Every structure is written in C-alpha cells, then in structure tokens.
Design a binder for this molecule. Structure first.
Ligand SMILES: C[S@@+](CC[C@H](N)C(=O)[O-])C[C@H]1O[C@@H](n2cnc3c(N)ncnc32)[C@H](O)[C@@H]1O
Ligand code: SF4
Ligand SMILES: [Mg+2]
Ligand SMILES: [Mg+2]
Lengths: 35, 326, 402
RNA sequence: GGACCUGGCGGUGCUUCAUAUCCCUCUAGAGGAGCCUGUUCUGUAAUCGAUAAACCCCGAUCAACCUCACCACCUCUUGCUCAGCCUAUAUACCGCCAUCUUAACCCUGAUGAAGGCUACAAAGUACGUUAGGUCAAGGUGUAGCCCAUGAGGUGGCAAGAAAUGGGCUACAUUUUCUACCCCAGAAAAUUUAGC
C-alpha cells in the first residue's frame, strides 16, 4: 500500500452491463435515454 | 527506456567492400595511426600502404582484404566517436556481416585488437588454402516470386553429379533481402544456374569477385585452424547487443561465441534475419539511427531493400575523404 | 473402489512396462485432433456455395444450441404426477398454464431441404468426430476385428459411413443407411459424389433406405445410431427401435448421443434394455455385454443426478465462422454380442484428468459398479501407476489389477 | 351398388411477364521473402510447461547462469505457530455470464353434404432448464494429504520434420528527402470484400 508506493519511489456506474441495461431500459438510471 | 530514435546501431561491412583509397580520411583522426602500427606489428606487412595505394589486385586477394576491412572498420569507429560522442555512447545493437563480426565484437569489448587481428589473419589464410583446395565460387541471384531456390540447387547438383564428382556442393550461402540470395559452390553448378536462369526464374545473376565458396562445407578444412587461434583468446561478455550470423540472434553467454564464430565459417549468413531482429517493430514506432562503420555502402542498400523505414535514418561513415582537416 | 493405496498394482501383460514407455500404455485411447476427409470437407463447402452468408452463421448457431439443450419428451406418466402436485398446491385450467411452464415443449423437426443444409453445416464435423472416437474404441482394443457389413439407423448426412470407411475401409463391403427424410438422403448421396448431383460415389456399396428393415434373419456386423434416438417422439419408439437394432446386430451395437443428461439417460435406457433380455426364444441366442465405456453391466452409478460424457477435439470444416478447433462432448455405449473377453476389466476415466504437483486427480468408474475419486501419488500408489495416470486422459482406461 | 359435395392435390409441366438475391459490369487488394503460433508425425526418463512469480530495459524478445512445473535419485518430519498445500468441488451453494422451453348475424340450395360475387352492382353485413462457463478485480460451506498432495538437496529437461490454418513487418516513381503545407530544390489464377 503506502509502503509499496514508497519503495516504488525509491526505484462509470460500476454495474454489470446487463444490470445497467435493465435499469437503463426501465428508466431507472437518470438521464440515460436511447438515441 | 530510451525512446527509439536517440539510440544507434552500428553495422560492420564484410568481404567485397574493399576499395583502393580506404583509410584516407581516417588517418588524421585520433588513435588511428596506433591501430595501423599494431596491425603492422601483428601481420608482418604494411596495411596502410596497401590500402591507401594498392593495385586493387593484391587488395582483392583473400589474405589481404579481410584484415584491411577489419582495421578500416575500427578506424571508422574512432572517427565516429570523435565526430559524435553521443552516438557511440547511445549504442544498442551491433552486427557484422562475415568478417565484420570480428570487428563488432572488438567494438563491444569482448576481444582485444591484437587478438582480433590474429584471429582474422589465421581465418583468411585458412580460407585461402581451402579455396585453393577445390575450385568453387559464389553467385548473387535476384529472383522473382515464381523462383524456387532449393529446386534450382537440386538440379545444379544433378548436373555436376552427371558430370561426376564426390558430393557436388550448391546451396544458398547468404540471405540478404527478399528474393536476393547468394548461392555458393562448384563453378559448374553456378554456370548451370547462370545458363538456366530463365527456367529457374532468376531475374539477375552476377558472379561475385571472390576466390572461392565462402559459407559452405567446402571451407571445413579452415575450421580447425581458426578454432585453435580462438582457443587462447578469452572472450568476455559483450557490452552492447552484438548479433550472430549463424542463427541471427544476440549472443547470450560468452562461452558460446567460441564455437559460433567457427560455425559461421561453414554456415550460411542469416543477414535478413538479423535485420529483422534489429528493426522489426509495429507500424508507427520510431527507428534507431543506423551507422555503417566501414568501407562502402552495401549494407545501406541491403537495409533499403529489407526495411525502407529503418533506412530512412541511415548514414555511412566516409572512410575515403574528410570534410574538415582535424 | 479399484484403487487401494499400496495394494493395487499395475497390470503387466505382454511384458508392457519393460518393453514400452508409459505414454503408450494400453489404456491410452485418446485420439489426436480429428480431421475430416478432404473429399467430405470439399463436398460440404461446395454444397453451401449458394447460401453461406451472415444468415447461415446465425442459423447454424441457433440449430446447434437448440439441439444441445433438447430434453427427452415428457412421458405422460411424468405429466400426471406434475399435474396432481400442482393440483394439490392450488387447492384445471390454471394447472395447465402452470404446466406449460416448468415443462419442456418437445417438437418434431421436419428435416426439409433448407433445414438439412443447416444441420450439415452444424453437425457434420461434430458428429463425425464423436463416431470416430467410438469406433476407435473397437479398433484399439480389438484390432483383429474386420467388419464386412454396417448399418446406420438415422443416417442424416452420412457421417457414420465416412467414419467407418476411415477405419475399416479395407474390409467393409455394405453400408446400409436408413433415414425417413427424403432430403437428408438426397443430401447424403451428393456428399458421396463430391458434392455434385452427378458423379462417382467415393465409398462403394452404400445402400439408402427410407424405412428400417425389420427381420432377424438379416444381421449386420456393426449397427450404429448416432444422435438419432433423441429425435424419436416417445419412449415406446425408442424401445422398439433399439430392440430391432439389437436383433440385427452381429458383433457390436454402437449408440452415440449428446453429452447431456437427456442424452445419457437415453443411452442407459437402451443399455438396460439390451442387457435385460426379454425375448423368450430369439433367433440369435447370444447374450450381450457392454464393450465400452462401462467396465460392468451393473446400473450406472452416475445416472442418479450426474451424467457421463466424453470429449473429442476436432478440426471444424473451414467456413465463414469456423476458425478455432472445437470439442465434441458426447455420450456413448457400445454393446457387444457374446461374453466379456477376460475377467481383467479396467476402470474408465470419465472426467478430465487434473494434473497437479506430484498428484493427479482421476474420477474412475470401477468394475465393481461404483465411482472412485482417486488422487494418485508416487508415494502412496507407486512410481509406475502414478506415471500411467500422469499420462492418462479423459476417456482412457487405467491398467490396475487387484 | 347409383348420383352428388368439399376437397387435398405435401403435386406435375409449359406460356407470359414483376424477376429483386445471384449473374455479367466497376474499384481494391489477397501469391512471394523473413520470423511467431494452431494441428499432425517422429523422439525422450522429462513439459520448445508457466512469471498478480524471472531475464528484458530502443523496439521486441529467446534461452535466463532465478523461482514454480516435469524426469532420475536422495534427505527431514512432530515438524511452525493443535503445523503446512493451493489440492478438488460453482459435477456443493450464492453472485455473475451464457443455452433452451413457456367470432356473431343474415340470406341461398325444397332447411343434403354445402354455398354467398358483378359498381350503369344481381345477399352479404359485421418462471423453470443446464453432468453449461466463470475461484482475475466477489463471497458461504464442503471434502482430501499430513513419516507427505509438506519442506529441502543433487543432476537432468530447454526437442526435430513437414503439409496446411492464422498472425506481424518492408514492398517506390501518382515514389522518396528538405523547405513549405501544394507555382520549389535534389534523390533514385482463383477468390475476397466494397458500393
Ligand atoms: C439428428 S439426424 C442424425 C445424424 C447422423 N446420425 C449424423 O451423424 O450425421 C436424425 C435422422 O433420423 C431421421 N429419423 C427421425 N425419426 C426417424 C424414424 N422414426 N425412422 C427413421 N428415421 C428417422 C431423421 O430424418 C434425421 O435425418
Ligand atoms: S462408464 Fe460408468 S458412469 Fe459412464 S455410463 Fe458407464 S457405468 Fe455410467
Ligand atoms: Mg459447472
Ligand atoms: Mg523446461
């Protein structure tokens, strides 16, 4: 973590695509319409 | 690490690049006189006079051309170092053709100058003796897509078998660039190929001005001498990536240069494979600088045929004249 | 349990271990990647030059998945138990609607000219590989068998005929091919003649019939049914066909289905039917035994909840959608006339062999009628048997004795 | 047995045309070199087997003189911590991906089968399923081995040949290099798609 970053120095919705579609297709994701 | 374009690759020429006046334009540059003095010390005759002012017929003899090319190549290395220190500093790959390989290793700090001259002298003498042993030669052939090379070699051997000889020899000895090869073997086979080019689909054929069949089994007698000469020499790890000719890859461990250098004597030269291993990259990626350190510009044309884009950033070190009298 | 650590030892007959390496042990039955004959591969592509565009790729995929996921037709008896159970829970029209769901709608496929091309583009290569693996079983373990006669019930595209030719082409003299569809018979003959309506058949002696002959007097050396018993409308039809095929079997009856639960259950019905002879006084009185893959005639130990299938990798016919090699998962049972050759039967590896550091996982159907999950290691079982299992693969035999 | 009705013809040929998909037509490449792979054969005792785990530090890369895997030999174990293994299992569950299944009325024929149109008009109107994949950005259990499926050491292993499938590079004169972004100077046959 920080130790790893230090030694290195020394050298959109987070859903599945389908679950996005169901929410997107049902109007459950705001502002995401179909072109 | 380094972006391609600020590094450099040094190409060392080989047999057939000698020219009268080679060495003029490098003589005044630093350290060159001492190299030629050491060459005089080791060989026993004056390379400087022969190279600067020669009949070209003594210079075309095998025993003389190879050491001359070796020394001229190294002198060009010192010239380039004087002119462009950064290029020598940023060197990624090195490659020699036939005898130029001995030069490249010396540039890579694997061998020392005197060791290299002794090895090259023994090599050239043994090769001349082997060429004297049996008549032979080489032919450069440029083919078209419908050309079959092993096929033509097979009938080239059939003809000489019909004439009568023990194991006729005719095989591709140098891969230079697409559809251009050099075949090597008995003169009758090469004459057969010349006269049957039309059947064999060879656009051009040109007998090389060479003593004998280099890079074939016909030079087996010369292998044992060179090995002895190379046994004493302690080859170190190359500082730069120096490529081989037997299989066209970077030398891994110094304990295998000893046998690969003797195997090159009786094996084809994988020049096209070496050019690929050095310059192949994806479309759009930049290419390194290329410097042909030695006499002539043959490797430049070969690179143009192999990889045009890599040839775009190619330059040759002038070993016949100099712009500025240092 | 055919593997007892420290007790079971490799079976060294013919002086195997001394005279041959372990990679070539007699239980090795793996077949290298199957390539179809060039005449067949060329013929299939030529027949499809008319229409092999983007539509065909979709059609071939739809047919392939539809056939793979088919269930056996639901016999009425299964239907009333489902009907009553739903009836009790509800406490007729409502039950039927709830029965259309949770039950499989089984439909006949009328193999017309159009759907016969799609089948050939989808199953010719796959079907050929599965049958080739099955026949390899008979050749490898009985290389002296030289059949002169062959029948193929459900001859759609002739894959069985081609596969039989590739193995027993020097002795077979008659290939009886049966298929009720006129279009499939028309397609199968074109494929024998280089994919053209006019030509010389590539294999000699092929006979095409639309109806299955029913007579015990005529008896064939090898009777084959590949991916055909799943097209029959009911269990009664499957019962009747398999009885006739066995009555006309001389040496071997090779049945091959999909490697699914529907396929495996189908073959275990047929396996029990032949083993449990019901005919009082048959013309051929010889008994029957399972030549492969089962090492026993006892009921299947995997039929309860699991299945039993095998895999054969093959090179698909070059098409606009076939690039990489595929695998053909299939179920098989081979029934042979007579009695087992010897008492030294060997377990069958029925599942992929997992090679792990210093130990190997083998799932074996043992001669005693039980499955055994064996983790074979050099320390427990021995250097020889571990190396034999290290090189073994799915569908091979493990040479173990006592 | 006589007369009649609806038919189906899983129909067959010819005639004419609509005749788009596919033909002809147009553009473009796709053979040849060099290397990397997929499959086969041969060979070994063995794996040209792998780096959330090494060389390689121009591009890439091979074997590295690394570690894991493999082969042949050996050593220790109550060990580490009531140790340790990543070993199996989603063919145990869940999650996630994917397959497949889920009309009435009015007339005509004598109130027979049956039939019903003419426009300058003659009865016609209205959820389950899966020996499914995924143990890499996720979990809950279940089993195995523990004088070895744990921990080590000494050597070896680093393949060869084709025919075909694919992929990566350079391939130029209507070109290349410099200045500019277009009035300058120097170089030298099958197919496959596509409108
Ligand atoms: C799924 S195909 C089998 C494919 C073939 N075994 C192969 O490997 O290519 C089944 C064939 O059996 C035929 N068939 C279905 N029912 C039949 C029956 N009752 N009697 C005879 N043939 C039948 C069908 O016409 C169909 O062509
Ligand atoms: S091999 Fe074993 S598991 Fe497979 S079908 Fe036969 S008895 Fe069943
Ligand atoms: Mg699963
Ligand atoms: Mg290895």
């Amino acid at each position: 973590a920080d130790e790893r970053l230090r030694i290195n120095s020394l050298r959109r919705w987070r859903l599945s695509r389908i679950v996005f579609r169901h929410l997107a297709d049902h109007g459950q994701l705001s502002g995401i319409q179909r072109a | 690490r380094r972006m391609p374009g600020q590094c450099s690759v040094l190409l060392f020429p080989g047999q057939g690049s000698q020219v009268v006046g080679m060495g003029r334009g490098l003589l005044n540059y630093p350290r060159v006189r001492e190299l030629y003095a050491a060459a005089r010390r080791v060989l026993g005759y004056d390379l400087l006079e022969l190279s600067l002012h020669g009949p070209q017929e003594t210079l075309d003899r095998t025993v003389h051309c190879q050491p001359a090319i070796f020394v001229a190549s190294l002198a060009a290395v010192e010239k380039l170092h004087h002119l462009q220190p950064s290029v020598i500093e940023n060197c990624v790959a090195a490659a020699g053709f036939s005898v130029g390989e001995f030069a490249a290793l010396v540039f890579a700090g694997a061998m020392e100058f005197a060791e290299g001259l002794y090895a090259v002298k023994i090599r050239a003498e043994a090769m001349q003796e082997a060429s004297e042993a049996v008549p032979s030669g080489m032919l450069s052939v440029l083919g078209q897509p419908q050309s079959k090379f092993n096929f033509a070699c097979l009938e080239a051997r059939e003809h000489c078998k019909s004439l009568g000889i023990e194991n006729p020899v005719c095989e591709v000895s140098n891969y230079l660039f697409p559809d251009c090869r050099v075949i090597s073997g008995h003169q009758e086979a090469l004459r057969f190929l010349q006269k049957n080019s039309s059947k064999f689909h060879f656009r051009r054929t040109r007998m090389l001005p060479v003593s004998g069949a280099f890079h074939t089994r016909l030079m087996e007698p010369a292998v044992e001498p060179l090995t002895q000469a190379l046994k004493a020499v302690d080859i170190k790890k190359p500082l730069v990536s120096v490529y081989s000719n037997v299989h066209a890859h970077r030398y891994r461990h110094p304990g295998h240069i000893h046998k690969l250098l003797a195997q090159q004597l009786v094996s084809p030269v994988k020049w096209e494979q070496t050019m690929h291993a050095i310059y192949e990259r994806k479309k759009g990626r930049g290419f390194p600088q290329t410097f042909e350190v030695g006499p002539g510009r043959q490797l430049g044309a070969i690179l143009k045929s192999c990889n045009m884009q890599a040839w775009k950033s190619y330059s040759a070190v002038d070993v016949l004249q100099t712009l500025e009298h240092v | 349990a055919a593997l007892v650590p420290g007790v079971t030892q490799v079976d060294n007959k013919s002086g195997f271990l001394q005279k041959r390496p372990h990679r070539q042990h007699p239980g090795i039955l793996k077949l290298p990647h199957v390539r179809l004959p060039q005449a067949l591969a060329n013929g299939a592509q030529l027949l499809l030059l008319g229409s092999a565009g983007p539509t065909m790729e979709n059609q071939v995929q739809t047919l392939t998945s539809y056939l793979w996921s088919r269930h056996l037709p639901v016999e009425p008896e299964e239907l009333q138990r489902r009907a009553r159970h739903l009836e009790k829970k509800f406490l007729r029209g409502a039950v039927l609607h709830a029965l259309r769901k949770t039950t499989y709608h089984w439909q006949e496929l009328s193999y017309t000219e159009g759907l016969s091309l799609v089948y050939m583009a989808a199953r010719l290569d796959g079907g050929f590989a599965a049958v080739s693996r099955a026949f390899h079983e008979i050749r490898a373990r009985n290389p002296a068998f030289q059949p002169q006669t062959l029948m193929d019930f459900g001859s759609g595209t002739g894959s069985v005929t081609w596969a039989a030719h590739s193995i027993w082409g020097q002795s077979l003299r008659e290939y009886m091919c049966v298929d009720r569809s006129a279009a499939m018979l028309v397609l199968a003959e074109k494929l024998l003649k280089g994919g053209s309506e006019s030509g010389e058949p590539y294999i000699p002696g092929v006979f095409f019939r639309q109806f299955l002959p029913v007579s015990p007097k005529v008896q064939f050396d090898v009777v084959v049914s590949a991916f055909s018993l799943s097209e029959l409308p009911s269990k009664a039809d499957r019962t009747e066909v398999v009885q006739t095929l066995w009555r006309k079997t001389g040496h071997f009856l090779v049945l091959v289905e999909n490697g699914t639960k529907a396929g495996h259950s189908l073959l275990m019905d047929a396996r029990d039917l032949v083993l449990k002879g019901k005919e009082k006084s048959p013309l051929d009185p010889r008994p029957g035994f399972v030549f492969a893959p089962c090492p026993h005639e006892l009921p299947c130990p995997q039929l309860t909840n699991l299945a039993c299938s095998f895999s054969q990798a093959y090179h698909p016919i070059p098409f606009s959608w076939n690039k990489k090699p595929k695998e053909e998962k299939f179920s098989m049972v081979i029934l042979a006339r007579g009695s087992p050759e010897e008492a030294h039967r060997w377990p069958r590896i029925t599942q992929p062999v997992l090679k792990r550091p210093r130990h190997v996982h083998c799932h074996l159907c043992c001669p005693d009628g039980h499955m055994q999950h064996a983790v074979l290691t050099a320390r427990r079982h021995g250097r020889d048997l571990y190396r034999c299992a290290r090189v073994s693969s799915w569908g091979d035999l493990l040479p173990v004795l006592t």
